[PDB]
């Protein structure tokens, strides 16, 4: 398990959870609506510590780029400016956001080759899959 595995450009081809994950970040109704419909691509880039992931969609695109193990601030898709720190830990990419004393963990993993990205905030879970293209 390296965080080299998770390179690439990834399509989505499944959600769970993830309309009540946003109603829980309090993500306003035409973000919601774009989220729902979207079916972005991940594409995934790392030279040794720094990482890039860009999510890209007709709807929606947002990229971040950070080194890991460094603390950053991250402006997400919905606009929060969160500090965030990615690690490469047990075979598995955390991103951990931490904004207004709250806090959401993002997970990124792959398994039977797919890309498997788990979200969790106050225990609202969701778990979305992408093929690689
Ligand atoms: C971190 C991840 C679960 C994520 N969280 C979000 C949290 C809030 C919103 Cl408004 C969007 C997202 C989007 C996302 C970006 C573009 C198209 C579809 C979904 C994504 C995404 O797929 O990158």
Avoid at 39 to 57: A, R, V, Y
Avoid at 121 to 128: D, Q, Y
Wanted: glycine share 8%.
């Amino acid at each position: 398990a390296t965080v080299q595995q998770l390179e690439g450009r990834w399509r989505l081809v499944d959600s769970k959870g993830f309309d009540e994950y946003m109603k829980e970040l309090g993500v306003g109704i035409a973000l919601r609506k774009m989220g729902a419909m979207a079916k972005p691509d991940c594409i995934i880039t790392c030279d040794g510590k720094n990482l890039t992931i860009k999510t890209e969609s007709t709807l929606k695109t947002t990229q971040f780029s950070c080194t890991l193990g460094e603390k950053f601030e991250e402006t997400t898709a919905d606009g929060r400016k969160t500090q965030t720190v990615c690690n490469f830990t047990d075979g598995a990419l955390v991103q951990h956001q931490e904004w207004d004393g709250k806090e959401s963990t993002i997970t990124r993993k792959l398994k039977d080759g797919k890309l498997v990205v788990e979200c969790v905030m106050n225990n609202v879970t969701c778990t979305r899959i992408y093929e690689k293209v």
